[PDB]
Amino acid sequence: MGYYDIDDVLADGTEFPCKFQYDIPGLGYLENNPGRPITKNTKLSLPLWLARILAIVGVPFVELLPPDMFSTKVMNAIKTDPVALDLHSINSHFFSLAIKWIMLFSEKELANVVSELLLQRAQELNHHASSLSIDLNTNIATSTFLLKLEEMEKEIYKKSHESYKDTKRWMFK
Amino acid sequence: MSLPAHLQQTFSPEEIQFIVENEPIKIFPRITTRQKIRNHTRWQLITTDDKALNNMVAMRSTEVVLWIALLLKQQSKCSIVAPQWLTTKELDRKIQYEKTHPDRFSELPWNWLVLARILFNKAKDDFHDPIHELRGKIQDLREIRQIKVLKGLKYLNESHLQLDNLSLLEINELRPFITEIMDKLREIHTASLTA
Amino acid sequence: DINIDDILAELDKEVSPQQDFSDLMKSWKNERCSPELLPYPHQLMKRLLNRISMQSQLIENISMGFLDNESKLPLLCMETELERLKFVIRSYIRCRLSKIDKFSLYLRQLNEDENSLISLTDLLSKDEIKYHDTHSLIWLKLVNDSILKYMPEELQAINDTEGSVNMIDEPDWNKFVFIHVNGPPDGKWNEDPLLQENEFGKPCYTVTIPDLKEEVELTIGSIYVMRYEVIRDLLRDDKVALI
Amino acid sequence: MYGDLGNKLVLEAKRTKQLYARSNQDVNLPMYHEDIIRNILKEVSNLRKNTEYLKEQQQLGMLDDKVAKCQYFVTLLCMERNKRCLLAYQRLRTDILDSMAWNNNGLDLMDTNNLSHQEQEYLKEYCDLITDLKSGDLVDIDLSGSLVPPSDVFIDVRVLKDAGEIQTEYGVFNLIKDSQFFVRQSDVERLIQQGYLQKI
Amino acid sequence: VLPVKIQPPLLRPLAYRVLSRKYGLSIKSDGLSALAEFVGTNIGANWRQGPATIKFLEQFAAVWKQQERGLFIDQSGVKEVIQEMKEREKPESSKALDWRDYFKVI
């Protein structure tokens, strides 16, 4: 959560569904009505970095609604088959946003689910990372699994696979 | 930056090799530097003790730092002695011990893989055992330890971990993955425990 | 029967470069894997610098004398030994610089903090202080004349911590690192406190994770993966070594 | 909303991060995106004008604390986010420039058109600072030297680019093209870094 | 200010240790010989030319920004620039600046 983390910066600017609590005047600069105000009980999508502050200061101005990524459907999908889930399709920065949402809401069950998902997928990505192709003179499963990773999983995978490749190169040099 | 990204928190295998290069090992000097009672320049180093080097006697085993022994082994002016764990009998006993206890690692010296690689590369003709068998048994130990590591990975908790008797190279190669997964699991728990 | 090891020890009880080099490598191992910037061993670096100066002078003198038997093996040994030492110190210093610039604002605010229990001089060498100051000033100049110039003053601070997200970087104390329980640096075990003898006869330490409120036993001669904050105090005592 | 420019800028920044991350190609920085910088600067200036407008209109008019506080706070947070995006992009460029300077201090001092004037001056002064650090107290050791351990002392090399004759520390090297030396690795590190000798 | 001639072989160790080791400067035989001649001309016994070589390398790195300074024009250029900086500070020259060196028609 460092200030200059590029992944954190990208994750901050993600729209989230959230209704309003006041008929606040003069807002909507790019929300389809620059001069016209924003009405009470209005459901709009707002960037997470701004919605975070707007959800605490106030009764808070904005009531955050549960996003589609953390709906009970996705929860059931995660609890069913963590390995065969294309989490990249759900979002490129799913784990960071899960961490931020849990930190804001102290929602322990989501944290318990996401930790299990992370462990189960870490097992498989380590299996793939330590698998090094050797030329007798890019496996199909490797690539078809790599597309279902967020940037952090793609980063841990790159680092671990680089370490494995360096070890193999030094060992057999 | 001053430190490249791939060297941020782990050691490159060359660094592990360099670190292991400072271990003392017993060798047979092919020269005799013992200046008789009846000029020459002493090694008079500062990273190690020159006393043994200035007092080497031909075909009389001494103990010197590993990399000096390798430097001498670049010529035929020395000879490396394999440590007691580099015998076929001890390797077989360690194999049996590993196969007997599936949940605990063998009590090998921490630098066994790198030492085996270095000795095989540069001291391939100083073993009483057939090198083609030593290589196979070393590879078998590496595979068995890998299999044990993978099964021990299925219990990655969020508080701590105990990798007992594990070697150095395996730890170095597994550091970036385990130390990063453990960080994310700790962060999730701490975010949950924000009350 | 009665043991006589006491009297044998009685009759046997009538700064070395190797120790300095071992301490330097221990510091380098800790510096490479610790998340935070460990204190600078000023005396040790001074002694190594003096040793390198005199050793290089001696090597040059030997070469000049030889430039007028032919056992050049020791000369090659001094050359490669000095090369290894120089490589070690180079890697150590560059790693310390990476840690300085990773936590440049943290170091600056600790310097400005009067309640801070340490001083940058007590943690950095003179060259490190010079580099920290120069880099901080120049990067501040660049951000000022590139971004902060066109910005109002309330958000122009280069160490804003009261914003939406803290903009000063801090060491991740809860980072997970590899440790090996060396035990007390001296060979005697009962002298050192906190070494509660665990079951099976194994001497061990006991430390608590406050987040989980969990007590963990660290046995000597064992390798563990630990949060750096818990180990930090023992690591300052050299009871454990970062792997 | 308002952070779209910063979002595109940080997306490009991460793109450059993966670009330089792959292997060690030592590519020059992508051209300074002065266009996005100027666009977001104009956005920030307009938002600052809006803040001043709201302040003066609240002073002359009758606006309750609710709307005057809320719109001003939202715009301030908008500047916070945009400034953070700019800071991240500039920090990435600065760190990659640091990498180029540290690796190439003994290699080469170079297309600078991709950098802004502030970045060019920063690199020019940072080379001076690095040299000052190398010559200050830790001059006995080479701070810009190779970070790989010196495993072997004597190695063989082949001349890639003929440089005629170059005086070494004691003797001299006749860098005839397609000729092989077998000499100490210590005194040929800089030449190999520059790209004259190839074999290991 | 004592004139003397110093041969390249003896100055080669120190010249290398300064230019190549300190800052990464490639030295050729012709450049080494010319620099030895210059050092001998502007100092006798060739001992305290270390500051002179350091000034040479720092000006070369600040202005030229390449390698292989031993080309008889990088050496001469840095020598002359040292001459004018010494002159404006008010060795080889201690005169005053002239506008003819700064006046030109294109």
Please enumerate in sequence order all residues whose Cβ is within 8 A of that of D166, keeping only pairs 6 or more positions apart, or say none: D172, D173, D175, D191, E26, E27, E28, E29, E68
Query: Could you please report the per-residue DSSP string of D29-74?
Result: PPPP-HHHHHHHHHHHHHHHHHHHHHHHHHHHS---HHHHHHHHHH
| DSSP codes joined into one string, chain C | ----HHHHHHHT----HHHHHHHHHHHHHHHHH-SS-PPP-HHHHHHHHHHHHHHHHHHHHHHHHHT-----HHHHHHHHHHHHHHHHHHHHHHHHHHHHHHTHHHHHHHHH-SS-S--HHHHS-HHHHHHHHHHHHHHHHHHHHHTGGGS-GGG--TT--SSSS--S----TT-EEEEEE---SSS-STTSTT-EE-GGG-EEEEEEETTTTEEEEEETT-EEEEEHHHHHHHHHTTSEEE-
Dihedral sign computed on CA atoms, order B173, B177, B180, B181: negative
Q: Where are the domains of chain C?
A: 15-169, 170-242
- Judge whether A121 is closer than 8 Å to chain C, CB to CB: no
User: Do the beta carbons of residue B36 and residue B82 sit within 8 Å?
Assistant: no
Q: Are E2 and E44 in contact (CB under 8 A)?
A: yes
Write out the two tokens for A144.
Answer: 């078809």
Chains that touch D (3 or more CB pairs under 8 A): A, B, C, E
Query: What is the amino acid identity at position B147?
Result: I
Pull the structure tokens for residue E70: 């031993």
Is residue B82 within 8 A of residue B127, CB to CB? The reply is yes
Domains, chain A, in order of start with CATH, read 3-173 (1.20.58.2050)
Cβ separation of C150 and D118 shorter than 8 Å?
no
| 8 Å CB contact between A39 and A20 | yes
Domain range for B44 is 3-193
Assess C168–A contact: CB distance below 8 Å, yes or no.
yes
* Cβ(B12)–Cβ(A166) below 8 Å: yes
CA-CA distance, B149 to D164, in Å (whole number)?
A: 56
The experimental method behind these coordinates is cryo-EM
Q: How far apart are alpha carbons D180 and C79 in whole angstroms?
A: 23
Integer Cα distance of D8 and B107 in angstroms: 54
Contacts of B156 (CB under 8 A, 6+ apart): A119, A122, B178, B181, B182, B185
**Which residue of chain B is at minimal alpha-carbon distance from C93?**
B2
d(CA E42, CA B80): 57
> Which chains have 3 or more CB–CB distances shorter than 8 Å to chain A?
B, C, D
CB spacing of A170 vs B184 below 8 angstroms:
no
User: D181: which strand partners?
Assistant: D157
Other beta carbons within 10 Å of C236: 12
C115 vs chain D: nearest CA distance in angstroms? Answer: 29
Contact state of D167 with E12 under an 8 Å Cβ cutoff: yes
Sign of dihedral through CA atoms E35, E41, E47, E52? negative
Torsion of CA D91, D93, D95, D98, to 10 degrees: -140
Cα–Cα nearest to A89, from A117, A71, A69: A69
Q: If you measure CA to CA, which chain D residue comes closest to B67?
A: D151
- By Cβ distance, the residue of D99, D148, D153 closest to B1 is D99
A7 at interface of B, judged by CB pairs closer than 8 A: no
Task: Find out whether E22 and E56 touch, Cβ atoms under 8 Å.
Answer: no
Which of B178, B143, B140, B148 minimizes the C-alpha distance to B160? B178
For chain B, list the contacting chains (3+ Cβ pairs, <8 Å): A, C, D
Strand pairing class (C223-227; C240-242): unpaired
Domain count, chain B: 1
- The DSSP string of B79-115 is -B---GGGSHHHHHHHHHHHHH-TTS-----TTHHHH
CB B111 within 8 A of CB B153: no
Tell if the CB–CB gap between E20 and D139 is shorter than 8 Å: no
Which of A160, A162, A173 would you mutate first to test chain B, the one with the most B CBs within 10 A?
A160
Q: At what angle do helices A94-105 and B168-192 cross, to 10 degrees?
A: 40
Asked if A24 is an interface residue toward chain D (Cβ–Cβ < 8 A), one would say yes
Residues making up chain E, counted from first to last: 106
Per-residue tokens: B29:
């000097």
Residues B46, B49, B54, CA angle at the centre, nearest 5°? Answer: 115
Asked if C216 is an interface residue toward chain D (Cβ–Cβ < 8 A), one would say no
Contact E65 D164 (CB under 8 A): no
CATH 3.40.50.980 fits C15-169, yes or no: no
C216 — alpha (psi -120 to 50), left (phi > 0) or beta? beta
Among all residues of chain A, which has the CA nearest to that of C170? A2
CA distance B10 to chain D (A): 14
With beta carbons less than 8 A apart as the criterion, state whether D1 and D83 touch.
no
Quote the CA–CA distance of C26 and E94 in Å, as a whole number.
55
Q: In angstroms, rounded to a whole number, what is the distance separating the alpha carbons of residues D50 and B146?
A: 63
Q: Long-range CB contacts (< 8 A, 24+ apart) of A77-86? A: A78/A113, A78/A114, A78/A117, A79/A113, A82/A116, A82/A117, A82/A120, A82/A121, A83/A120, A83/A121, A83/A124, A85/A117, A85/A148, A86/A147, A86/A148
Closest of B13, B57, B4 to residue B175, by C-alpha: B13
CA distances from C179 to B14, B164, C7, C213, C224 (A): 21, 11, 38, 20, 5
What whole-number distance in Å separates Cα of residue E57 and Cα of residue E59? 6
Strands C176-181 and C223-227 turn out to be antiparallel
**Which residues, other chains included, contact C124 with Cβ-Cβ below 8 Å and sequence gap of 6+?**
C40, C100, C107, C132
Give Cα separations from A78 to A75, A125, A127, B12 (angstroms): 5, 16, 20, 36
Residue holding tokens 């440089």? D163
Task: Give me the helices (H) in A41-139, please.
Answer: 48-54, 72-80, 87-90, 94-105, 108-129
Instruction: Say if B10 is an interface residue toward chain D (CB within 8 Å).
Output: no
Q: How far apart are CA C38 and CA C242, in angstroms?
A: 12
Token digits of residue A121: 């997928």
Q: Which of helix, strand or coil describes residue A19?
A: strand
- C106 CB burial (10 A radius; 0-12, 13-18, 19+): middle
